[PDB]
């Protein structure tokens, strides 16, 4: 069937999988878990989260243990284990950069700093980063990535178990803002490349003249993006799967490139620059490790652009993070991923993260095709509960949906909505037709209202509680009376794992 | 066998099922649960409460999906599921009215406000209530109910699984006191029919002259009850099952008809007016959603009348409401029903509700024929514990029973009785002969005493503890000594579900 | 000195007292406390709150105990008590309306319903409201309000102790939407006065045509307003002090005119209509009895208009409400009042209410003239802490002020601001000059920032901490180093009642 493919239309985006839009609901294994003895039980816990995609790494360390000789044991164990559990795969290439450092580089490069030079910090000392200015390093990386992509086409070119590939992992530089070895110093003395200055709408000039106090940071950002562009472009020729990079962000007050966050990753302050140099990268993921509504919401706003879909490549594996899956979808997002799900010490919090994320993957997994297609069409709206503001209004032309949090499951709301004690409320509404809606969520109440500039009056016609089994709509019951008198109410997941229901709402007038 | 039939004799009442009095021990489904995919687990939960009757709705919405075409899918599944599980059925016709509103009315009526007019409020605005003054509405309701009763005769005319039928559900008007549409304004300027003022012992005149400030409400009560009389009379011609209506009450400080409670239902302030217009309705049920002893008692007092039996068609599904089963039985009541029992979120309160109600349905179900006959004959007395007054005296001519709450299971009762901490005490006494009594209850002590204007002295002769199995008395043990020294004492249901015992007491003199 | 006078300029408002803007920081006695034996201890408690204005009623009941004969005892004792204690007075005229009812109307009107008719409700029954359609009522009221204002000019025309007069108290009708007596029925069938239809930009027509479902409420709104306009104009002729009316609001989900709130008060849904009929009423005050930030903020938004200043005539006397004094001021408000302060039973809550409100009155009283002039000029911004959003940015052209809640008193702010636990944060900034600012508040941090389209850089030049003694800036110390490294930080009132300090901040560039 078709190749997985990233698609952009009218400022909206979609990941095309097997011909249609696809919503990634992902769980990532820990860094050191992509090994054949660990993979089966680690992928079992991915199934227990009801995710559709597992994110797991391929280590350059083990993939090229000797120059030109490649070992596919691990990647083959990954894909086999996913296939046997019905999962798609997001392949993470731990190449020259993982977390802004070089620790996953093969031993034969770690041993030869003369052939494969490290960056030099302001004091002249080496750091654990490869130099983005020496042709040997970017060619080694681009060569090994090509070997991986070529093997990927060979064993997965028909099945397409691998759905996306992440080129590097949180790239940039930890330990310095820019390279101070000779080649980097020489490059920094040259002016900005003219194609870059044009793409930004800027005259020609030096890094200082076009970027001010951010000259060094912007310089290394372009060096890192141009390096990755070579590696990415190489893999494209072998096998043009969709490619993305993930970002250790500039957020939570992090202000120091090279210590707070890797200098020269795809951070908000250099975003347009970074993308201008990477036409072979399709989109950018955000690694969001916070629970705060304002900060989470702020990051998503930075990266949900006409040129970039919302896409959470990583978020903390904790209960308090589950509501944002609905915010992310509600900004047109293509996917949502929790990190570090396997083998954690047993604790209340770890059980609570399992139960919380299992629940809404279990709830939206049977709906993902419908959700994805509606997100591309602009017919999907979704929201996460905000602590100081327990009400939202969703507009659907002639109709409006008023979403309330902290209301009782039955009866009149209080004068002042208190919100939910754990602020876990969320809701999604997909407009199926001019007067039909699919609704689902957790700890929320929704009420539909008509305006329309008619003289006519709005009313409920049919409320169907049901499930989709294979993409067939199975009506369990029809809601009315008590179940309709005070809006449509979504409670909690029961102890047996079952999440709040999915509802088909048809309205009309008289 | 015999058609189920409501019976009145000497100001005492009984529901005749299969030729004899029958006590309804009922559990009602949630409004949206009478659907084929939901009924089996729902009805299973009724069985676990040991009810003899399930109360479940037939939705006009689904029963006549097009004018004159009727669908029996749901009603057949409800009768089928009940027969399989040993249950009798109390069928609830969600017709023109459910909780004062028209939401169960078919789509082809909701779409045509011009053929099927809605009530108008004092601002001229429509409300969610069909007009009771336009022939098209009452006729469509009457015609549909007729079809339902005709079908019921066809599939259940011999078996009589359906025992009683509720015509509408909490009727009256929410949104306004009376109709301000043209037909309602017209009728309101006409005088009071002659027959109603006659039945009320009133002179002829206008609504304001005979009812004062209650003119509008009394007007809509008559209009509502006359509308329902047409629907019930049509049903009585097809299949004359016993018919009743349930009442969203004027209680608990509710004072505003149209917003506190449906204006025009069989509320206590318009009861005799409502019943005069409804000879085809056999009795009225009370929907009591409170746990307070004084308010619960007061409402049963209002509705336990020479022309009307005590009958709880809905009460809250909570442990605190279990004792009132015995207060209702002890006022002549014919049945008791807990509402909304299926599929609730698991919680200690819901587990306590199941445990409390299953226990006394389990305790009284083998006894129901005896209790129902005794109640018709005036031989049944039963009480519920009152918080400030933990003692009751029951008079049986020559013999009196002293019922105490909060005494120990054995030994001397304290100087001041404290009652039970949870106030759960209740007790029932059926006089079987001139010197023989059947006794059962929860958390109670009963001592028998003889007066009788003899020089003779009363004494205990024989106390049999045991059970009724298929209408057969099975003696387990005989009580004496410790078990008799300090009255007969009933404790608590054990964790294995077994409720306190049934006692046959035989007394004498010397 | 100059007559008190309300003033509007460029869509900004001010209350002029002694020739200059004046910010009312008010406390209102309980309804029954304006009696000679009660006033002195009651007024003493007002001084304990450090208020500048006491609000207290004059009762028509006692002021006119026989027709035409007036008793000035209570009003003389109120004024005498305020002058002793250095308080200004806001006089409240409990006339024909107080809380939508007539209970303060004199006895000789209460005995004579024939001469002074009551409104009739929809059932033809009287209610406790004088009819707004019979001339005898309005003329009685206006005659006595005239007498009061004339006596006010005689005894206070030079001193001007009385600063504003409230005409009626929360007027409107409780018990009915409109009068159903003959006069009101007749008028309600007439068309809208042309002047009113012009003022609202509407064609000629009936009440139903021009207001739809709000015909009755708009009709009585106008009847009430015009009645008051007669009373107010009569008093403007005697003594043209500023005059206002206070509103029992349509807020907190109140939806039912006549029962939730007095039908026809100056509520949000009839506001323009009400003012169009009341030119002799200068402004409208809001009685806000909630603690919720959304609802408090929403009401202030509704009534802070180009034609009306924010003015909180009543708010709950509780600690939770003290932050809103600063939100009200930041919306141009002219005054803020706490209600019911004297003689309350001793409790933790009442003690906290005295401490919270005495604190910020003590903080802002010595600054009130400066705050009032600054607010008129548009140079004043102030904020109250929002629970979900613990940051705010204040723009002052070239300079910006970042306000943080929940920061430590010293040291770095956390990545995520948690806000204050009790949400008591609030801060006010008065721009004194192009680079000078006055700052004060509670539990808040502020940091200034320069942008300004220069190449220059911002810097602090001088921070003075101190007070205003009698119009004098008295510097106590100058803040630098630790007290300036993490913004300027306001903590809490100490147990000795001293509130956080007042800062003068001079900035500059280089």
Give the distance from residue A499's alpha carbon to the nearest chain B alpha carbon, in angstroms. 12
C355, C493 in Cβ contact below 8 A? yes
B124/C213 CB distance under 8 A: yes
The contacts of residue B154 (CB under 8 Å, 6+ apart) are none
- Are the CB atoms for C172 and C97 separated by under 8 Å? yes
* CA–CA distance, A23 with A52 (Å, rounded to integer): 9
CB pair distance less than 8 Å for B30 and A482: yes
Alpha-carbon span A117 to B317, nearest angstrom: 75
Residue B254: its chain C contacts at CB < 8 A?
Answer: none
Q: Please give the Cα distance from A324 to A291 (Å, whole number).
A: 9
Q: How far is the CA of C457 from the CAs of A125, B140, B317, C333, in angstroms? A: 34, 81, 70, 35
CA-CA distance, C295 to A415, in Å (whole number)? 9
- Enter the tokens of residue A200: 């930004």
3-state secondary structure at position B267: coil
Comparing CA positions, the residue from C376, C353, C333 lying closest to residue C424 is C353
Q: Are C438 and C370 within 8 A, CB to CB?
A: yes
> In degrees, to the nearest 5, what angle opens at C-alpha B392 toward C-alphas B390 and B393?
155
Contact A430/A415 with Cβ under 8 angstroms? no
Rounded distance, CA A510 to CA B251, Å?
35
Query: Under an 8 A CB cutoff, do A480 and B33 touch?
Result: no
Q: Which residues of C touch B185 (CB under 8 A)?
A: none
Go through B456-465 and write b for each residue having 16 or more CB atoms within 10 A of its CB, e for each that does not. Answer: eebeeeebbe
Contact C124 B208 (CB under 8 A): yes
Cα–Cα distance measured from residue C350 to residue C359, given in angstroms and rounded to the nearest whole number: 14
Is C292 in Cβ contact with A388 (below 8 Å)?
Answer: no
Neighbours of C122 (CB within 10 A): 18
Structure tokens at C135: 């001339």
As a dihedral over the C-alpha atoms of residue A232, residue A233, residue A234, residue A236, rounded to 10 degrees, the angle is 90
Q: Give the mutation candidate from B31, B57, B127 for the A interface (greatest A CB count, under 10 A).
A: B31
Instruction: Classify burial at A491, counting beta carbons within 10 Å of its beta carbon; exposed 0-12, middle 13-18, buried 19 or more.
Output: middle
Please give the Cα distance from A488 to A438 (Å, whole number): 12
The helix/strand/coil state of B6 is: strand
The long-range contacts involving C140-144, CB below 8 angstroms and separated by at least 24 positions, are: C140/C96, C140/C109, C140/C116, C141/C60, C141/C95, C141/C96, C141/C227, C141/C231, C142/C230, C142/C231, C142/C233, C142/C234, C142/C235, C143/C234, C144/C60, C144/C63, C144/C64, C144/C70, C144/C95
How many helices (H) and strands (E) in chain C? 15, 23
Determine contact: A485 vs chain C, CB below 8 A: no
* Locus of tokens 């129901």: B368
- Which of B37, B94, B126 lies at the smallest CB-CB distance from A477? B37
Contacts of C256 in chain B (CB under 8 A): 259
* Distance between CA atoms of residues B165 and B149, nearest Å: 9
Longest dimension (CA), chain C: 81
Task: Tell me which chain C residues have a C-beta less than 8 angstroms from the C-beta of A416.
Answer: 252, 290, 292, 294-295
Radius of gyration of chain B (CA): 24
CB contact at 8 A, C252 and A416? yes
Which structure tokens are listed for B501? Answer: 């015992």
Helices then strands, each counted (H, E), chain B? 15, 23
Chain B partners within 8 Å of C254 (Cβ): none
Query: Which residues, including other chains, have CB under 8 Å from residue B238's CB and lie 6 or more apart?
Result: B146, B149, B150, B153
How many angstroms separate the CA atoms of B356 and B354, rounded? 6
B214 and C256 in contact by Cβ < 8 A? no
Distance between CA atoms of B114 and B328, rounded to whole angstroms?
A: 45
Rounded CA-CA distance C330/C172 in Å is 30
Beta bridge partners of C315: C288
**Range C345-352, long-range pairs (CB < 8 A, 24+ positions):** C349/C318, C349/C319, C350/C317, C352/C318, C352/C319
* C429 SS3 class: strand
Measured CA to CA, the distance from residue B339 to residue B286 in angstroms comes to 12
Resolution of this entry in Å?
2.5
Within 10 angstroms of residue C485's Cβ, the number of other Cβ atoms is 10
**Cα B384 from chain centre:** 17
**Neighbouring residues of C350: CB distance < 8 A, sequence distance ≥ 6:** C317, C344
Which residue is it, tokens 């005898």?
A: C136
DSSP tag of B101? B
SS3 content of chain B, % helix, strand, coil (to 5): 30, 30, 40
Measured CA distances, B405 to B391, B442, B501 (Å): 6, 10, 17
Assigned token pair, B315: 């009460």
The Cα–Cα gap between A178 and A264 comes to 8
The nearest alpha carbon in chain B to A476 belongs to: B37
For C362, half-sphere exposure in the C-beta direction (CA atoms, 13 angstrom radius) is: 19
For residue B357, is it left (φ>0), alpha (ψ between -120 and 50) or beta?
Answer: alpha
Report which of A99, A83, A85, A82 is spatially closest to residue A171, judged by C-alpha positions: A99
DSSP 8-state symbol, A414? P
SS3 at position A101? strand
- As separate numbers, helices (DSSP H) first and strands (DSSP E) second, chain A gives 15, 23
- The answer to whether residues A175 and A268 touch, using CB atoms and an 8 Å cutoff, is no
Q: From A36, A55, A298, A316, select the one nearest A164 (Cα to Cα).
A: A55
Question: Which chain B residues in 324-343 lie under 8 Å from chain A, judged by CB atoms?
Answer: 340
CB contact under 8 A, C122 and B123: no
For A286-301, b where at least 16 C-beta lie within 10 A, e where not — what string? bbbebbebbbbeebbe
- Nearest chain A residue to C254 by CA: give it: A415
Tokens at A343, concatenated: 């083998």
Count of other CB atoms within 10 angstroms of residue C263: 28
Number of A to B CB contacts under 8 A, please give it. 56
Q: Which two tokens stand for residue B50?
A: 């040991």
Question: How many residues are given for chain A?
Answer: 510
According to DSSP, residue B413 is labeled P
Q: In terms of Cα–Cα distance, which of B442, B253, B447 is closest to B364?
A: B442
Distance from CA of C26 to the nearest CA of B (A): 38
Q: Residue A356 has which token pair?
A: 């919380």
Instruction: Tell me which residue in C122, C124, C213 faces B125 most closely, judged by beta carbons.
Output: C213
Q: What is the DSSP letter of B161?
A: -
DSSP secondary structure, A162-219, as one string: EEEEEEEES-SBSS-SS--SHHHHHHHHSPPPHHHHHHTT--S--HHHHHGGGHHHHH
- Spatial separation of the C-alpha atoms in residues A205 and A308, rounded to whole Å: 28
Collect all residues of chain A within an 8 Å Cβ-Cβ radius of residue B106. none
Q: Which residues contact A323 (CB under 8 A, 6 or more apart)?
A: A384, A385, A423, A424, A425, A426, A442
Is there a contact between C123 and B215 if contact means CB atoms under 8 Å apart?
A: yes
DSSP type of residue A135: H
The single residue listed with the structure tokens 């442990």 is: B319
Q: Are A326 and A364 in contact (CB under 8 A)?
A: no
- How far, CA to CA in Å, does B252 sit from each of A446, B294, C178, C389, C393? 30, 10, 28, 41, 51
Sheet holding A380-384, edge to edge: A380-384, A426-433, A436-442, A502-509, A458-468, A473-478
Q: Which DSSP string corresponds to A230-250?
A: HHHHHHHHH----EEEEEE-S
Q: With b meaning 16 or more CB within 10 Å and e meaning fewer, what string describes A135-160?
A: eebbebbbebbbbbbebbbeebeeeb
Does residue C394 contact residue C381 with C-beta atoms inside 8 Å?
Answer: yes
Helices A215-238 and A135-156 sit at what angle, rounded to 10 degrees?
Answer: 40
The number of CA neighbours under 13 Å toward the Cβ of C306 is: 3
Cα–Cα distance measured from residue C510 to residue C507, given in angstroms and rounded to the nearest whole number: 11
- Integer Rg of chain A from CA: 24
Under DSSP, the state recorded for A10 is T
Chain C contact for A387 (CB, 8 A cutoff):
yes
Number of Cβ within a 10 Å radius of residue A497: 12
Sequence-ordered list of residues with C-beta below 8 angstroms from that of B495, at least 6 positions apart, any chain: none
Q: Do residues B188 and B234 touch, judged by C-beta distance below 8 A?
A: no
As a whole number of Å, the CA-based R_g of chain C is 24
- Residue B278 per-residue DSSP state: -
DSSP 8-state code for residue B212: G
Q: How far apart are CA A268 and CA A259, in angstroms?
A: 16
**B215 at interface of C, judged by CB pairs closer than 8 A:** yes
Query: Can you read off the two tokens belonging to residue C16?
Result: 């002029």
C148: number of Cβ within 10 Å? 22
Q: What are phi and psi of B317, to 5 degrees?
A: -95, 80
- Contact of B345 with chain A, judged by CB distance below 8 Å, is answered with yes
Q: Extract the tokens encoding B322.
A: 């279990």
In degrees and rounded to multiples of 5, residue B222 shows phi and psi of -60, -50
User: Residue B358 burial (CB < 10 Å; 0-12/13-18/19+)?
Assistant: buried
From chain C, the residues in CB contact with A290 under 8 A are 415-416
Ramachandran bin of A406, using left for φ above 0, alpha for ψ from -120 to 50, beta for the remaining angles = left
Crossing angle for the helix pair C73-85 and C39-48, to the nearest 10 degrees: 30
Q: Which residues of C199-237 are buried (b: 16+ CB within 10 A; e: fewer)?
A: eeeeeeeebbebbeebbbbbbbbbbbbbbbbbbbbbbbe
Q: Are C317 and C361 in contact (CB under 8 A)?
A: no
How far apart, in whole angstroms, are the C-alpha atoms of residue C301 and residue C331? 8
What gap in Å lies between CA A60 and CA A141, rounded to an integer?
9
Are residues A245 and A228 in contact, defined by beta-carbon separation less than 8 angstroms? yes
- B155 vs A376, B38, B72, B150, CA distance in Å? 52, 22, 11, 9
Rounded to the nearest angstrom, the gap between the alpha carbon of residue B300 and the centroid of all alpha carbons in its chain is 10
d(CA C192, CA C210): 8
Using a 10 angstrom Cβ sphere, with 0-12 exposed, 13-18 middle and 19 or more buried, the burial of residue A214 is middle
What is the 8-class DSSP label of residue C257?
Answer: B
Assess B107–A contact: CB distance below 8 Å, yes or no: yes
Q: Is B364 helix (H, G, I), strand (E, B) or coil?
A: helix
Q: Do C125 and B213 touch (CB under 8 A)?
A: yes
């Amino acid at each position: 069937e078709e190749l997985p493919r990233f698609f952009t239309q009218n400022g909206r985006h979609a990941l095309l999988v097997d011909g249609a839009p696809y919503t990634i609901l992902a769980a990532q294994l820990h860094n050191s878990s992509a090994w054949p003895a660990v993979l089966p039980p680690a992928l079992d816990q991915v199934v227990a989260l009801h995710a559709n995609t597992v994110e797991a790494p391929v280590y350059w360390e083990q993939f090229e243990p000797a120059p030109g000789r490649f070992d596919t044991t691990n990647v083959d164990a990954l894909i086999a284990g996913a296939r046997k559990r019905g999962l798609r795969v997001a392949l993470l290439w731990f190449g020259s950069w993982k977390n802004g450092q070089m620790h996953y580089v093969p031993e034969w490069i770690k041993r030869d700093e003369a052939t494969y030079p490290r960056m030099r910090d302001a004091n002249g000392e080496p750091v654990d980063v490869l130099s983005p200015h020496v042709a040997a390093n970017v060619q080694a990386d681009a060569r090994a990535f090509t070997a991986l992509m070529q093997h990927l086409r060979k064993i997965d070119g028909d099945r397409h178990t691998v759905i996306v590939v992440q080129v590097e992992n949180e790239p940039g530089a930890i330990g310095t803002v820019r390279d101070h070895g000779p080649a980097g110093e020489a490059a920094f003395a040259q002016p900005v490349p003219a194609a870059i200055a044009a793409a930004l709408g800027k005259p020609a000039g030096s890094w200082q003249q076009l970027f001010g106090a951010e000259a060094a940071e912007a310089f290394n950002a372009h060096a890192t993006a141009a390096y990755i562009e070579q590696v990415a472009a190489a893999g494209k020729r072998a096998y043009p799967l969709p490619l993305y990079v993930n970002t250790w962000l500039r957020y939570k007050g992090k202000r120091y490139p090279g210590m707070d966050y890797p200098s020269g990753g795809a951070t908000v302050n250099v975003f347009a620059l970074w993308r201008a140099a990477t036409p072979s990268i399709d989109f950018i993921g955000t690694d969001i490790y916070t629970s705060d509504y304002g900060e989470y919401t702020k990051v998503i706003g930075q990266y949900a652009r006409p040129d970039n879909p919302a896409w959470v490549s990583e978020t903390g594996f904790e209960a308090a993070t589950a509501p944002y899956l609905f915010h992310v979808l509600g900004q047109g997002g293509i996917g949502f991923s929790v990190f570090g799900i396997d083998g954690n010490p047993d604790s209340g919090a770890n059980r609570a993260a399992i139960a919380a994320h299992a629940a809404n993957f279990r709830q939206l997994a049977p709906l993902q095709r419908l959700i994805a297609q509606a997100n591309l069409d602009g017919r999907l709206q979704a929201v996460a509960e905000q602590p100081g503001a327990p009400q939202r209004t969703l507009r659907f032309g002639d109709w409006e949906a008023k979403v309330s949090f902290g209301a009782p499951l039955w009866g009149d709301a209080p004068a002042i909505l208190p919100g939910n004690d754990d602020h876990a409320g969320r809701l999604l509404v997909a407009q199926l037709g001019p007067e039909e809606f699919l609704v689902t969520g957790t700890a929320a109440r929704i009420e539909f209202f008509r305006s329309a500039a008619d003289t006519r009056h709005g009313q409920l016609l049919q409320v169907e509680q049901g499930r989709y089994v294979d993409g067939r709509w199975q009506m369990e019951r029809q809601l009315n009376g008590d179940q309709t008198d005070y809006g449509l109410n979504f409670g909690r997941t029961d102890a047996a794992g079952q999440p709040p229901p999915v509802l088909r709402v048809r309205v009309g007038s008289y």
